[PDB]
Design a protein around this ligand. Structure first.
Ligand SMILES: O=C(COP(=O)(O)O)[C@@H](O)[C@H](O)COP(=O)(O)O
Ligand SMILES: [Mg+2]
Length: 225
């Protein structure tokens, strides 16, 4: 059996990206700029992880209004919006996720998050979906700007593994996206993928398992081999 499970957040714990998109767009509108990311645009922008990095990519060549604030300030406002939206309880965990975490806890298996997303989003999602602070759910939280290079860099996973003190051969990652799979694999981890809306078009070569739902894992034993 594995000794630790490392979870991605967006698209893994919950289907969140349309809520991120909303938060971006509503922030743009509040700032009085003409920017608006439709699904087609957002699907492409999602291949750059981290909201600051995504905004920067967009600004490099978009031909609408110039940024009126630093990126970090735009992103901070977006995060406050996302947190507020997340709290409303419209988003639930993806099927299978709650049950896996409960089984892991009963088995004494160590749990981490390993995410590109801002730390407040992790807290918001945990409070909403689990009813507790994130550090009551996960033993280790590796998020956001804790590393210099985001997925597909393995660095966030290497951070999480160091903090867990579990060798990669005894752990497993759950992911939804190709950049996530690449990051996990680059850290030496077996990786179970279940994609979503934005990510299903991707090919997931090297995934240990590729599932339509985490409810198909089959319990902790499905994380083995
Ligand atoms: O690329 C990401 C995927 O998160 P994960 O690694 O959990 O799949 C994030 O940048 C989110 O799109 C937005 O969150 P922020 O705006 O907070 O970055
Ligand atoms: Mg993800």
């Amino acid at each position: 059996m594995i000794e630790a499970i490392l979870f991605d957040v967006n698209g893994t714990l919950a289907e969140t990206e349309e809520l991120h998109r909303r938060a971006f767009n509503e922030t743009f509108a509040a700032l009085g700029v003409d920017w608006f990311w439709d699904r087609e645009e957002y699907r492409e922008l999602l291949t750059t992880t981290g909201g600051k990095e995504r905004i920067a990519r967009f600004l490099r060549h978009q031909k609408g209004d110039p940024a009126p604030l630093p990126i970090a300030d735009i992103h901070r406002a977006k995060t406050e919006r996302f947190v507020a939206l997340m709290a409303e309880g419209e988003i639930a965990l993806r099927p299978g996720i709650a049950d896996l975490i409960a089984e892991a806890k009963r088995a004494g298996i160590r749990l981490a998050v390993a995410t590109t997303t801002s730390l407040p989003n992790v807290e918001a999602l945990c409070r909403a979906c689990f009813g507790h602070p994130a550090r009551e759910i996960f033993d280790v939280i590796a998020a956001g700007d804790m590393v210099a290079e985001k997925k597909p860099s393995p660095d966030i996973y290497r951070l999480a593994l160091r903090e867990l003190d579990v060798p990669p051969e005894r752990a497993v990652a759950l992911e939804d996206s190709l950049n996530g799979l690449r990051a996990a694999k680059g850290a030496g981890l077996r990786c179970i993928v279940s994609p979503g809306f934005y990510t299903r078009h991707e090919e997931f070569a090297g995934a240990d398992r590729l599932l339509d739902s985490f409810a198909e894992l089959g319990g902790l034993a499905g994380l083995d081999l």
